[PDB]
Amino acid sequence: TLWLTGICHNEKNEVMSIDNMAGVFYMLAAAMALSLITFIWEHLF
């Protein structure tokens, strides 16, 4: 108690502070592929 503590003893959950999570970078890879699902079905019947 005399000698140790500085500021890391009072660490306060150093999260992020804007954000760049992955998210939509997955989702866009679905969405255009959805057109690749659909617009090959040219109804030539």
Partner: protein
């Protein structure tokens, strides 16, 4: 508060995504409206001025983009709540005073009883090279030292500091009452009138003459508690300049396109 804190590259990604929405809503019209329609549908749905209606798979993708728009609005409003609602010298127990630094120099006035309370205790040993090498002649010099931002904190009697904190917006009395003593009267030992004066002191405590000086000199003043903004004023400036530039381009573009149509 500020301008946009949200990583302006991300705002550019938002604008490019709006143009991707425009490209997707014009190129998929031809599978069964290609001039100025889907621009205003993109500014209808992506501004959420209209979320509703106006082949199948293109509109499936469009309402997926509307889902993106709602999630982005939710995330940015969550950040507006976060970065506005989310995240000092407390006393001798601080390492700023147990290990006193030169970025944190503190002082008093020499030949005072406060310096007596410093010099009595033992654990203030590192403090005496700040509290005896930097001192003043009046407490108003320490007040100005706060006001000139010379020294960061000061240690004085409670009542005057609470008064001056209730006066102006530079002062907060922090920490407990250090060295809890009483405020007495300088009386010689052979003075026979310690007696009836202290009886009058008992009367002052019992009949509230202490509370009478609390009314007549102590309890008068306060300050505010921070309770039409800088973000708002930035919105006024940006929206005003945008409306001026937009209107003064309306005349040019509509004049040239009306004379295109006159052809």
């Amino acid at each position: 508060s500020f301008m946009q804190p949200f990583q302006s590259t991300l705002w550019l990604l938002v604008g490019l995504s709006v143009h991707v929405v425009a490209v997707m809503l014009y190129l998929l019209d031809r599978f069964s409206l290609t001039l100025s329609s889907a621009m205003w549908f993109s500014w209808r749905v992506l501004l959420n001025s209209g979320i509703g209606e106006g082949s199948f798979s293109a509109r499936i993708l469009g309402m997926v983009w509307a889902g993106f728009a709602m999630i982005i609005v939710a995330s940015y409003t969550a950040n507006l709540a976060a970065f506005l609602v989310l995240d000092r010298i407390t006393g001798i127990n601080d390492p700023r005073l147990r290990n006193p630094s030169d970025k944190f120099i503190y002082a008093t006035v020499k030949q005072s009883s406060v310096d007596i309370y410093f010099r009595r205790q033992v654990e203030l040993s590192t403090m005496y090279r700040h509290m005896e090498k930097h001192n003043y002649e009046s407490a108003a010099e320490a007040i100005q030292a706060v006001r000139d931002n010379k020294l960061h904190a000061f240690i004085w009697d409670s009542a005057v500091l609470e008064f001056e904190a209730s006066q102006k917006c530079d002062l907060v009395t922090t920490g407990e009452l250090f060295f809890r003593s009483g405020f007495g009267i300088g009386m010689r030992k052979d003075s026979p009138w310690k007696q009836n004066v202290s009886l009058s002191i008992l009367k002052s405590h019992e009949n509230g003459f202490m509370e009478d000086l609390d009314k007549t000199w102590v309890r008068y003043q306060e300050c505010d508690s921070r309770s039409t903004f800088e973000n708002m004023a930035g919105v006024f400036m940006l929206v005003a300049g945008g409306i001026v530039a937009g209107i003064f381009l309306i005349f040019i573009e509509i004049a040239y396109k009306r004379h295109k149509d006159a052809r």
